Amino acid sequence: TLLQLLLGH
Amino acid sequence: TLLQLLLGH
Amino acid sequence: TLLQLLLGH
Amino acid sequence: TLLQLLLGH
Amino acid sequence: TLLQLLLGH
Amino acid sequence: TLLQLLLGH
Amino acid sequence: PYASLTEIEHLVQSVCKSYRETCQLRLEDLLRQRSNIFSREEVTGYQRKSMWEMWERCAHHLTEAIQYVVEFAKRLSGFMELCQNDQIVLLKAGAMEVVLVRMCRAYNADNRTVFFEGKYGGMELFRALGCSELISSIFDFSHSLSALHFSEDEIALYTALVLINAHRPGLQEKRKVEQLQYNLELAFHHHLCKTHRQSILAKLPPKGKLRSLCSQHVERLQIFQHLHPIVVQAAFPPLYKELFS
Amino acid sequence: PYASLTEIEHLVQSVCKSYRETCQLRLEDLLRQRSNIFSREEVTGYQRKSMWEMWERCAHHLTEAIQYVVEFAKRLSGFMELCQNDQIVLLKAGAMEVVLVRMCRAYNADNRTVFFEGKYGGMELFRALGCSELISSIFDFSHSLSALHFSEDEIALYTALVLINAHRPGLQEKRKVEQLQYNLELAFHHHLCKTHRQSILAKLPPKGKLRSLCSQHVERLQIFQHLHPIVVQAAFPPLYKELFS
Amino acid sequence: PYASLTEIEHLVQSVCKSYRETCQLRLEDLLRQRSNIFSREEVTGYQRKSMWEMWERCAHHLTEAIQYVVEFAKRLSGFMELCQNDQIVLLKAGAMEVVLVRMCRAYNADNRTVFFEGKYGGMELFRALGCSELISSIFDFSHSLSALHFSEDEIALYTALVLINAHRPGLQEKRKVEQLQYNLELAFHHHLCKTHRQSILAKLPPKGKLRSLCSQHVERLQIFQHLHPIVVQAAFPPLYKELFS
Amino acid sequence: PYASLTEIEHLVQSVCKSYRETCQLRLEDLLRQRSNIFSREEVTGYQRKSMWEMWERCAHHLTEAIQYVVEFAKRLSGFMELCQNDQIVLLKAGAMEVVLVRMCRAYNADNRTVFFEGKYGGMELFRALGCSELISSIFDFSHSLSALHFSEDEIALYTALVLINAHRPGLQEKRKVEQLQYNLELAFHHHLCKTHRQSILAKLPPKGKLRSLCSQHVERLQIFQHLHPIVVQAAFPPLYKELFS
Amino acid sequence: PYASLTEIEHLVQSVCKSYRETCQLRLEDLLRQRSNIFSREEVTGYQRKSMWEMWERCAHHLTEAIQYVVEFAKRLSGFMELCQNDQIVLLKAGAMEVVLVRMCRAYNADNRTVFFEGKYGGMELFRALGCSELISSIFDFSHSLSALHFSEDEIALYTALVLINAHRPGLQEKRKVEQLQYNLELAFHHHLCKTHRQSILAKLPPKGKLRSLCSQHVERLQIFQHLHPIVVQAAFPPLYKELFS
Amino acid sequence: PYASLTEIEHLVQSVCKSYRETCQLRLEDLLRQRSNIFSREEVTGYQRKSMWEMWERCAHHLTEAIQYVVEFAKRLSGFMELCQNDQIVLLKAGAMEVVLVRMCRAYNADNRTVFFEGKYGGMELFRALGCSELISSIFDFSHSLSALHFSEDEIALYTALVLINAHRPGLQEKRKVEQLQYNLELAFHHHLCKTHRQSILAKLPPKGKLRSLCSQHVERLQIFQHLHPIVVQAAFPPLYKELFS
Ligand SMILES: CC(C)=CCC[C@@H](C)[C@H]1CC[C@H]2C3=C(CC[C@]12C)[C@@]1(C)CC[C@H](O)[C@@](C)(C(=O)O)[C@@H]1CC3
Ligand SMILES: CC(C)=CCC[C@@H](C)[C@H]1CC[C@H]2C3=C(CC[C@]12C)[C@@]1(C)CC[C@H](O)[C@@](C)(C(=O)O)[C@@H]1CC3
Ligand SMILES: CC(C)=CCC[C@@H](C)[C@H]1CC[C@H]2C3=C(CC[C@]12C)[C@@]1(C)CC[C@H](O)[C@@](C)(C(=O)O)[C@@H]1CC3
Ligand SMILES: CC(C)=CCC[C@@H](C)[C@H]1CC[C@H]2C3=C(CC[C@]12C)[C@@]1(C)CC[C@H](O)[C@@](C)(C(=O)O)[C@@H]1CC3
Ligand SMILES: CC(C)=CCC[C@@H](C)[C@H]1CC[C@H]2C3=C(CC[C@]12C)[C@@]1(C)CC[C@H](O)[C@@](C)(C(=O)O)[C@@H]1CC3
Ligand SMILES: CC(C)=CCC[C@@H](C)[C@H]1CC[C@H]2C3=C(CC[C@]12C)[C@@]1(C)CC[C@H](O)[C@@](C)(C(=O)O)[C@@H]1CC3
């Protein structure tokens, strides 16, 4: 999710 | 004129 | 100074 | 023939 | 040997 | 002369 | 070299980009659908349509592409900087020429089929047009082009030169076009040598080959514009009517 | 040529730029500090630190770099256009791989020292980690890379290919990645030939060499995540925890 | 660059020349006869020949080409400088491999026909051989090669590398071959980049593909050498017997 | 290669663009007016003007060009990133040097005429200046430059190097200039080899040739600044006064 | 690329060498004597010579050059391989064409003078010929050529194409010439792109320009061959008589 | 381009070949023996030899190399075409210069060792010479050269220019040398740009650096020629005596 946040998902 | 319109005359 | 003005000093 | 001679005919 | 002959051995 | 010899003078 | 290399390889990029944006169909999509052919049944459906439908149909599909060509022109480097009159003259006489060139991307040469209305179809979908000799002439043209295996960059530069033609009558600032045409000729030639593709310059079809086709089209139109004058007046897209009077 | 040269030398520029912006440390700064070494006293201070400090320390420094790699990915041409799932899969399994490649810039090979926390230090600052075999394997890797004398452009393109890998499991739109990977392979190869650097393609380390290192890392982590489970839960940066579970 | 460019583009010329002289059939002649096909009647005549004729026939035609390959080897730069033993090992295991590569020039892919005994014939002239699976495998191989559209220079360099293989068992001075192989690899790669043909390196068939074919040939031979042992002893050319024991 | 090619051919484009925007007169316009000469009558009108007019006249025309050179500097890549002091030092001592180089575009060598005030005029319009030896030295300089047949790109890069000179006294961050100068030297040299124009590097005039001219100018000024001190104080443009004290 | 690059850049070298050996006058010698002009007195001496001397004089000087052109042909790659008839046809109709091209090296364009009999002379040495319009047409031709600033390699390749012309009537194996002509066209075009000199292809004079000159020469000869029939029969060199009947 | 590219890339090949044939030691052999060092015991044996032995020893080893340099000169393109006097002047003053350049191939920079008498030895084998400052100056020179990582082609071209020097006093046909020198300068520069190695032109050591070394050698010789005059008269090779009087 943090990785998803860093991208924009 | 339509061609003129498409360009901007 | 005029030269300084032309640049932004 | 002279031209022919120059080549080798 | 024939192959050797073709090369020169 | 030896140098001349090495070249061919 | 005396000309600015940076300036000429800028133009090469500018032209290729302006085409890339106005390429209508993206090529990878045009290729993957080459296994998507009209069935024997479907084809018959096309050729038993009425002449005034197949004309009205194609005249819309044609004007679809022509619109993109106009966008290409507008985004073309130094095209707008030309005179307003000349700007029209080049587009009017040249737009149809460009489309015929662009067709070679939607034309598969293994089966001689063009990508028409969702699928690939043969020369004989357009039987109902009555001008089935012009159709053959067109397919033959796109075959020769397809034989050259153009890159997308070479299409971009070729079509650019097709449009920019100072040999077109009615030009006010003709000398202005000559200069623009030359820089584009230089840019094209430079890119071909950059890619060892110089060989195709001689392989290119004559300037009159498209003169034939485009006029052969407007010739068969005047026939239809007389057979069904009320149809072309009411249905045919205005931009088409304007260009092919 | 059949592929658009303008398109491929555009990609080469796009990739090199996206790296140039996310290069973390600028190279000239990384080089001038090569005469800035840890003293014999300083080194001892590092190796007498506690394992749960040196792990927590490095795990933060690692996540520092990994964050930049994520930015590189986002700015990478056609990466975002991939599926959201695939976008994660490539980054998760590949981010650690990229960092290991980027290290060769912060690794001086004359003295076998890496730029760690302000100065250059040897293989044995990381003695306190307990995984001092993996450290050696890493230093050996960055040595081979440093031996190739990469350009900054070649780093940019290599790391791009490291990330874009269609051989990574869990990919939904795999075919989509294959296409992107190929264009990047073409772009890399084109640039190497443009620069007579084609020789290095065979000199490059096998795809499994980094498979070894990255997994060897997560292996020694699970040891630490069991020895000091409460430490990694409370201190280790979340992004690190997310990637190396 | 650190290697001598003059030395490497000398090798490229040397190899291309040595092939050019031992190309057996000149290409323009091989191409113009592509409209010279075996009639339906003629083909039947071939497949109703006896197995011991079609084998004896082809074994002579094969040894014809193999002789030219030997000449290519002798004229190949730095081949003779190798050890006499190694010189034999490379030729013996590699001559058959080269011929299979050279076939792609005598293979038209539009009709899947090979230039055999004066005319172009299909896969089924060789029906009488009994090994009609190997024949298909061969035609499929030459199809993939024909798909790449090799230049005559690329054939010259590829076949050179096919012969010079340090991975061949029985080599005394193996390290000597490795060095020669590398310079040829460098020369090949340099020429491909000089011509923007680097793309084909990945397109090339695996090293085992020809390992399969050449061994698959000697496998079906041992069958025939047992069915008609007296035929191969009395008729088959000695050079063939020597190479395929 | 070890330096980033993408970075260096970026600089080449950046410099050529910054010049292209600050080129004052566009070249095609400068060329077409080469058949627009001062009549025998007009010339006499110039040389019978007063010294304090011809000085005040030219000092304005000079400051006109110098202003454009300042813009070039500002748009020059990595010029503003220099120290404010150094930024002044380079411009002050170098602006006059650049203008002398740019003159070769407004100098036709067939007739030895410079484009002055709307038309092309000879060496002797500037007779009224009293420093008619310096004028000749200037015309001779622009002749040698015109003999080299510079491209507009080569002018762009040459003038860039003329400005960026770490050998100029009064530099604070000298090492900073050296680095910028080198990258520009590399970029210039790369572009010349890209265009087979490397030959001109030796043909270029010595660094002292412009040292002579620019100082020879300020020398004859101090004469005029003493003969007509009140004229230069009241009429001469301030930027001129500031640069040539 | 599909054509053998090694084969085409071999031809480029072969042609340039064959010309280099049969260049008659070496260029550096032709250039250094450009300050060696016929005095006003000397010129008058030429134009007050008799028509039957100036014709007999030039006809020998012409046949001098033509002999070298024949040698060029013999050493030209694949010229002798042509049919004996075709070999004559090309030389006969083409030798005069080549000489006219070669003249541009002995023609200084600054003063419009040709290197004749030891010194450079103007258009009016040949006043005594009576065909002083053809002379002017010739000088104008060599001016346009001199304006292009040919390299010695480009002269070598251009003249090669001038000779090898399949559009010449009387050719038996015409198709044989077409093939040779094309390879030379490819070689010329390749070398121009190798040197960024592709621009001159369009700048080249039309094929009919030399058709005009060479026939215009034989036209004025038939006049002289009728005015002084006994002179041309007894004095004019046989090779000249044979070519221009 | 105006110069014949074919002519200049012919010279590049000619020079590289003439060096390749007179390279004395082949490079691969010079490299593989870099792990073949003089033991601590062996070195002491050298430095406890007598000055009149170590001088007589080296003077023979030097004349060994100098002989090869003479062969290089003879095979050098257009060297023999020079005047007999000039031919001597260049060789005499230049042979020693070339050898010093060639040494960088027999000099490993990792350990600062030169390949002397079968093995690699340090700066201090030559302690017994008494001129141990010149030795250091020499080793420092070959270090800077070794730092540039010359190709064998670049050595070939550099050494060519070292020999061909029109700035050498005593030249009769000086202008003849200037022309030959320039073509070699052009050829060198062309090859460097062909290989992206243009960067080294500025990195090259000044013309006076070898002026220093060669004269510094003949200076320390005159000392020895006075200390042991009878030794140099009876033992020293005549060619050495002739060159260094
Ligand atoms: C009387 C008339 C108009 C006769 C012409 C009939 C025929 C030849 C003509 C009628 C419709 C027209 C057509 C094209 C060019 C010729 C063709 C087929 C192409 C293929 C060019 C490329 C465009 O990208 C693309 C794919 C598009 O519109 O997307 C079109 C699809 C429709
Ligand atoms: C258990 C673990 C994590 C073991 C790994 C320990 C070691 C190998 C590992 C821990 C910290 C980490 C590190 C880098 C890669 C490997 C290394 C040293 C580099 C050099 C890569 C490039 C970045 O630009 C730069 C300079 C930065 O963050 O600025 C870092 C600095 C810190
Ligand atoms: C049991 C066996 C031997 C099976 C193989 C049967 C088949 C595949 C095999 C038998 C005969 C052989 C053959 C060639 C390779 C494969 C093939 C056809 C080619 C085409 C290679 C190129 C040479 O240039 C050329 C033209 C020549 O000899 O001139 C020959 C012509 C004859
Ligand atoms: C005492 C002094 C100042 C003596 C100098 C006198 C002479 C040499 C000097 C006085 C005026 C000056 C001048 C130029 C350089 C030298 C020159 C002629 C040029 C041609 C450079 C290029 C610019 O683009 C351009 C066209 C412009 O301003 O548009 C100018 C036109 C005016
Ligand atoms: C009736 C006739 C024949 C009219 C032609 C008259 C004139 C045009 C014609 C008569 C003599 C002839 C001539 C040349 C070509 C044209 C020209 C001058 C050139 C310059 C070509 C290059 C050769 O290298 C070179 C230098 C040589 O012979 O060495 C000659 C020198 C003599
Ligand atoms: C008083 C004097 C002569 C002092 C010089 C002493 C020293 C510097 C001097 C004496 C002997 C000499 C020498 C070379 C150059 C310098 C050096 C070492 C080199 C290495 C150049 C390259 C040749 O290929 C090679 C390998 C050869 O002869 O094969 C020689 C080997 C012997």
User: Cα separation of K141 and K157, whole Å?
Assistant: 18
For residue H155, give Cα distances in angstroms to H9, H103, H109: 16, 11, 17
Residue L210 dihedral angles phi and psi, to the nearest 5°: -85, -25
Given strand G119-121, what is the order of strands in its sheet? Answer: G107-108, G113-116, G119-121
- Give, as one character, the DSSP assignment of residue J37: B
Give the CATH architecture of domain I1-245.
Answer: Orthogonal Bundle (1.10)
Report the distance separating Cα G236 and Cα J12, nearest Å.
Answer: 52
Provide the greatest CA pair distance for chain I: 61
- Contacts with J31 (C-beta within 8 Å, 6 or more apart), sequence order: none
Does residue G61 line the site of ligand 1, with CB under 6 A?
Answer: yes
- For residue H243, the ligand closest to its alpha carbon is 2
Q: Are H120 and H37 in contact (CB under 8 A)?
A: yes
Please tell me the distance in Å from A9's CA to the nearest CA on chain H.
Answer: 7
Closest CA relative to residue H93, chosen from H171, H168, H155: H168
What's the resolution in A?
Answer: 3.5
Phi, psi torsion values for J116, nearest 5 degrees = -120, 120
- List Cβ neighbours of G212 (8 Å cut-off, separation of 6 or more): G137
- The packing angle between helices L132-147 and L207-227, to 10°, is 150
Query: How far is residue K180's CA from residue K172's CA, in Å, rounded to a whole number?
Result: 14
Helix (H) or strand (E) holding H115: strand H113-116
Using the beta-carbon criterion (under 8 Å), do K195 and J196 form an inter-chain contact? yes
Exposure string of K162-175, with b = 16+ CB inside 10 Å and e = fewer, is bbbbbebeebeebe
CA-to-CA separations, I22 to I26, I65, I66, I238, in angstroms, rounded:
9, 10, 11, 21
Chain A residues with CB under 8 Å of H239 CB are 2-3, 6
Q: Rounded CA gap, L137 and L143, in Å? A: 10
Q: How far apart are CA L169 and CA J201, in angstroms?
A: 26
Tell me, yes or no, if H2 comes closer than 8 A to chain G by beta carbon. yes
> How many C-beta neighbours within 10 Å does residue H202 have?
10
Query: Who contacts H228 (Cβ-Cβ below 8 Å, separation ≥6)?
Result: H51, H52, H55
* CA dist J227 → J134, J221, J230 (Å): 18, 10, 9
Separation of CA K237 and ligand 5 centre (Å): 15
CB pairs under 8 A between H and I: 18
CA pair distance K60, K239, nearest whole angstrom: 10
Q: Which residues contact I75 (CB under 8 A, 6 or more apart)?
A: I17, I18, I21, I22
Q: Which residues, in sequence order, are CB contacts of J51 under 8 Å at separation 6+?
A: J128, J129, J130, J224, J227, J228
Pairwise CA distance, residues K143 & K230, whole Å: 35
Of H124, H127, H104, nearest to H115 by C-alpha is H104
Euclidean distance between CA atoms J133 and J139, whole angstroms: 10
Number of helices (H) and strands (E), helices first, in chain C?
A: 1, 0
Contacts of F3 in chain L (CB under 8 A): 70, 88, 91-92, 239, 242-243
Instruction: Tell me if L155 CB under 6 Å of ligand 6.
Output: no
Which residue stretches of K48-199 are H helix? Answer: 51-75, 84-102, 132-147, 152-163, 174-194
Q: What is the 3-state secondary structure (H, E, C) of I54-99?
A: HHHHHHHHHHHHHHHHHHHHHHCCCCCCCCHHHHHHHHHHHHHHHH
- Strands of the sheet containing I113-116, edge to edge, are I107-108, I113-116, I119-121
Q: How many CB atoms lie within 10 A of CB I118?
A: 9
Q: Are G54 and G126 in contact (CB under 8 A)?
A: yes
φ, ψ for residue H108, nearest 5 deg = -85, 130
Cβ within 8 Å, pair I70-E2:
no
Chain J contact present for K196, CB below 8 A: yes
Which residue bears the tokens 């190899």?
I15
What is the distance between the alpha carbons of residues I20 and I17, in angstroms, rounded to a whole number?
Answer: 5
Contact between G50 and G128 (Cβ < 8 Å): yes
Rounded to whole angstroms, the Cα distance separating C4 from J210 reads: 24
Locate the ligand 4 atom nearest the alpha carbon of residue J59 and give its number.
3
Q: Which of F2, F4, F7 shows the shortest C-beta gap to L74?
A: F7
Could you tell me how many residues make up chain G? 245
Which of G193, G199, G202 is nearest residue K198 as measured by Cβ atoms? G193
K13:L4 CB<8 A: no
Q: Which chain H residues contact residue J183 at CB under 8 A?
A: none
Distance separating alpha carbons of residues I16 and I153, to the nearest angstrom: 6
- Which ligand gives the minimal distance to the CA of H25? 2
Phi, psi of I58 (to 5 degrees): -65, -35
What percent helix, strand, coil does chain F show, rounded to 5?
65, 0, 35
Within 13 A of J18's CA, how many CA atoms are on the CB side? 22
3-state secondary structure of G208: helix
Which residues are CB-neighbours of I128 under 8 A, at least 6 positions away? I46, I47, I48, I49, I50, I51, I53, I54
Decide if H4 touches G, using CB distance below 8 A: yes
Degrees, nearest 5: CA angle G66-G70-G76: 135
- Residue C5 near residue J91 (C-beta atoms within 8 A): no
Rg (CA), chain H: 19
Token pair for H111: 């003295």
Which of J2, J6, J7 would you mutate first to test chain H, the one with the most H CBs within 10 A?
J6
Residue type present at position K190: H
Q: Which residues of B touch G70 (CB under 8 A)?
A: 3, 6-7
Could you give the strand order of the β-sheet that contains K107-108, starting from the edge strand earlier in sequence? K107-108, K113-116, K119-121
G contacts of H4 (beta carbons < 8 Å): 16, 151-153
Taking every pair of Cα atoms in chain J, the longest distance, rounded to a whole number of angstroms, is 61
Coil, helix or strand at residue J228: coil
Ligand index nearest the alpha carbon of residue I67 = 3
Cα–Cα dist L231/L229, whole Å: 5
Q: Please tell me which of the candidates J13, J149, J196 has its beta carbon nearest to residue G6.
A: J13
* Amino acid at site L118: G
Largest alpha-carbon pair distance within chain G? Answer: 61
Q: Which residue has the tokens 């000079």?
A: J62
In angstroms, the separation between the Cα of residue G84 and the nearest Cα of chain K is: 30
φ and ψ at residue L108, rounded to 5 degrees: -85, 130
CA angle J205, J208, J210 (to 5 degrees): 75
The helix-helix angle for I152-163 and I174-194 (nearest 10°) equals 160
Task: Please tell me the distance from the alpha carbon of residue H135 to that of residue H220, in angstroms, as a whole number.
Answer: 11
Question: How many helices and strands, by DSSP H and E, does chain I display?
Answer: 12, 3
- Taking alpha carbons only, the member of G11, G170, G166 closest to residue G78 is G11
Q: What is the spatial distance between Cα G225 and Cα G236, in angstroms, rounded to a whole number?
A: 10
Q: What three-state secondary structure class fits I171?
A: coil
Whole-number Å distance between alpha carbons of J25 and J102 = 10
What is the spatial distance between Cα G33 and Cα K57, in angstroms, rounded to a whole number? 75
DSSP letters along I12-32, please?
HHHHHHHHHHT-SS-HHHHHH
Distance CA(I164)–CA(I11), nearest Å, equals 14
CA dihedral of residues I136, I137, I138, I142 (deg, nearest 10): 100
- Best mutation site among H30, H58, H120, H244 for ligand 2 pocket (most ligand atoms within 8 Å of CB): H58
| L132 CB neighbour count, 10 Å cutoff | 15
Q: Decide if K190 contacts K202 (C-beta within 8 A).
A: no
Q: What is the dihedral of CA K139, K226, K67, K117, to 10 degrees?
A: -50
Handedness of CA L208, L211, L217, L218 (dihedral sign): negative
Q: First and final CA of chain A: distance in angstroms? A: 8
Q: Tell me which ligand sits closest to the C-alpha of residue I26.
A: 3
Cα separation values, L225 from H66, J35, L49, L220, Å: 70, 74, 18, 9
Q: Whole-angstrom Cα distance, residue L119 to residue L32?
A: 11
| Tokens 């220099």 -> residue | J82
> How deeply is E5 buried, as exposed, middle or buried, from its count of CB atoms within 10 A (0-12, 13-18, 19+)?
exposed
Tokens 């870099």 sit on residue: L34
| Distance linking the first and last C-alpha atoms of chain K | 46
G54 HSE (CA, 13 A, CB side)? 21
Cα–Cα nearest to H79, from H189, H191, H190, H161: H161
Instruction: Tell me if residue K222 falls in helix, strand or coil.
Output: helix
**DSSP per residue, G69-92:** HHHHHHHSTTTTTS-HHHHHHHHH
Q: H119 forms bridges with which residues in the sheet? A: H116
Distance (Å, whole) CA I174 – CA I177: 5
CA separation (Å) from G209 to G107, G164, G188?
Answer: 18, 17, 20
- C-alpha span between G138 and J113 (Å, rounded): 57
Q: How was this structure determined?
A: X-ray
Which one, of H15, H20, H6, H25, lies nearest residue H158 by Cα?
H15
Say how far apart CA J92 and CA J165 lie, in whole Å. 12
Q: What is the 3-state secondary structure of I101-127?
A: HHHHHCEECCCCEEEECCEEECHHHHH
Give the residue from J138, J52, J65, J53 showing the smallest Cα distance to J98: J65
Q: What are phi and psi of J118, to 5 degrees?
A: 100, -30
Among chain H residues, CA nearest to I5: H196
Mark yes or no for CB contact I4/L152 under 8 Å: yes
Burial of H112 (0-12, 13-18, 19+ CB in 10 A): middle
Helix and strand element counts for chain E (H, E):
1, 0
Please give the distance, rounded to the nearest whole angstrom, from the Cα atom of residue J174 to the centre of ligand 6.
41
Chain D residues within 8 A of K243 when measuring between CB atoms: 3
Structure tokens at L13: 């090949």
CA distance J195 to G190: 12
Is residue G104 in contact with ligand 1, taking CB distance under 6 Å?
no
C-alpha I156/C-alpha I14 separation (Å) is 10
Return the closest-CA partner of residue H63 out of L126, J239, A3, L102.
Answer: A3
Give the separation between CA L75 and CA K122, rounded to whole angstroms.
44
DSSP line for H112-126? TEEEETTEEE-GGGG
Indicate the top mutation candidate among H23, H116, H220 to test ligand 2's pocket, ranked by most ligand atoms within 8 A of CB: H116
Q: How far is the CA of J57 from the centre of ligand 4 (A)?
A: 10
H170 SS3 class:
coil
CB H12 within 8 A of CB H190: yes
- What would the two tokens of residue H19 be? 């790296």
β-pairing, J107-108 vs J113-116, is antiparallel
User: How far, in Å, is the centroid of ligand 5 from the Cα of K58?
Assistant: 7
Report the distance separating Cα J27 and Cα J36, nearest Å.
15
CB J86 within 8 A of CB J177: yes
For residue J28, report the distance from its CA to the centre of ligand 4, in Å.
Answer: 18
Phi and psi at I121, nearest 5°, equal -130, 155
Q: How many CA atoms lie within 13 A of K146 on its CB side?
A: 20
Question: Using CA atoms in the order I87, I93, I96, I102, what is the torsion angle rounded to 10 degrees?
Answer: -60
D vs K, Cβ pairs < 8 A, gives 26
List strand residue ranges (DSSP E) for J103-205, in order: 107-108, 113-116, 119-121
H/E segment holding residue L194: helix L174-194
In angstroms, the separation between the Cα of residue L17 and the nearest Cα of chain F is: 19
| Angle in degrees, CA L67, L73, L75, rounded to 5 | 110
DSSP letters, L65-97, are HHHHHHHHHHHSTTTTTS-HHHHHHHHHHHHHH
Q: Do the beta carbons of residue K120 and residue K33 sit within 8 Å?
A: yes
- What the block records as the tokens of H61 is 């420094």
Tokens of K17: 């060498």
DSSP 8-state secondary structure symbol assigned to residue L129:
G
Strand bridging mode J107-108 / H107-108 = unpaired
Query: Cβ neighbours of residue F4 under 8 Å, at least 6 residues apart?
Result: L84, L88
Q: Which residues of H touch L196 (CB under 8 A)?
A: 195-196
**C-beta of residue H138 within 8 angstroms of C-beta of residue H123:** no
Contact flag L5-K152 (C-beta cutoff 8 Å): no
Distance CA G103, CA G144 (A): 12
The residue among L199, L188, L33, L210 whose CA lies nearest residue L113 is L33
C-alpha K228/C-alpha K55 separation (Å) is 10
Instruction: Judge contact between L82 and L61, C-beta under 8 A.
Output: no
Phi, psi of J115 (to 5 degrees): -80, 95
Q: Which ligand is closest to the CA of L220, given by its number?
A: 6
Alpha carbon nearest to ligand 1 atom 10, residue: G58
- Is the Cβ of H186 closer than 8 Å to some Cβ of chain I? yes
Q: Are I50 and K38 in contact (CB under 8 A)?
A: no
